[PDB]
Amino acid sequence: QLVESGGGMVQAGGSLRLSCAASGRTFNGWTAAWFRQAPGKDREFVAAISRSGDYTYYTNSVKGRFTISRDSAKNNLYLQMDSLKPEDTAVYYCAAKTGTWATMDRRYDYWGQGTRVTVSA
């Protein structure tokens, strides 16, 4: 099952790298995405990488600061979080999909448990 890791607390400006993997599974035939849920708010799209792996899509607020990618073997999904801001504070969720990418959480099939990221002023 999907498991996230790499969260914690960082002061504004810092960097993080979130990781997502599934035991005995690979992301070969899967569309993968990251969502986040700031406290009190709803799950919102962060980033996604296509099944082919040749195209990446980001929400405007994180475009140019975050980078989603996969390793060669496609065992792991990463989110490089650079130039962090306080509003990036949320619980980050890993999501997977068999079909083409979407930005709505209910369109994804499998989810991780979430990992907390807190950015302080």
Add this chain to the structure above:
Amino acid sequence: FNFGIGYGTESGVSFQAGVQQDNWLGTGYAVGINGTKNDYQTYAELSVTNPYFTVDGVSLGGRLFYNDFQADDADLSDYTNKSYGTDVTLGFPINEYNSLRAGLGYVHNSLSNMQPQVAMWRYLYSMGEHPSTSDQDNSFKTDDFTFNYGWTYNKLDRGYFPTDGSRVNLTGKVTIPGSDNEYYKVTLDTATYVPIDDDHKWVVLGRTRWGYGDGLGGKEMPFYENFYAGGSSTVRGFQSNTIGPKAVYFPHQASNDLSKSDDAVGGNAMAVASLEFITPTPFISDKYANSVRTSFFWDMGTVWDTNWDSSQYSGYPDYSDPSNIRMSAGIALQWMSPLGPLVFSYAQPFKKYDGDKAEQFQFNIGKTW
């Protein structure tokens, strides 16, 4: 009660269930319920016929259906289309090999979860719809009435493994004044078998498939009526529906400059052709030879968007170009195994274009009881 289960690379796990009652409560009407479930589609219909209504071989049939389509699971730009409608059809038998049909249809299309893209939003704009380009939470409902026409020529010598004759199927529909949409759509399918030897062990097969549609009076044909190409049944060696225009996505924004892709969306025009050489299976001249068929094939096809404005989007490929013919070649195996009919194929797409997705190994297996 008839049930059917299947598994294939085009539609994953397939389930089918049907019940037909020739005389329903002594009314003389023949009633049937049917259901189908895919990786991407759920379909249910209610069929009605009555042989006592047939006049000079012209029959009348009814249909009431529901359809749930998940475009993302068909390797298309994501959207959902939940539809329902009715069809009344007349069947004219011209001769022993030709029949005609004509009917009226109503359909309610309820669209949702549309992932903003240029071509999709182009059709929406032509309908007066202006949904946000930064969000997938949207909706578009329409009600259409259509006139449906069909012609089928079938002179194939055998149903299962044909060796001689041809089959042609031509269909066409157009919206009736009063419908929300305004468009027509034409489809043409042909198969031709030519045996070269007396035993018909060696057979040349030519397949073609065509589709064209467009809007009327300033409208565009809805994207959910698009044609597709690529897959086990069209152009082998290519992932299902990958051939043709690719989505150009608008940027997503949270609740408070475009992006290229390799996600197919289909088009309003389509052309497919295939040449296949059917041969005996090597060294199985036993009793099992009649149930096994080997073949070598050459497939090609293209799909394009006649209303794609390459001027406004010069940074992106010209998806209105009909000349990007994709080609593939390979070998196919057909077997009436104990578990049902099986088809396996290996093809190499030697002519492909930017964004095309390959699928060299493709197969479909079904079973009905």
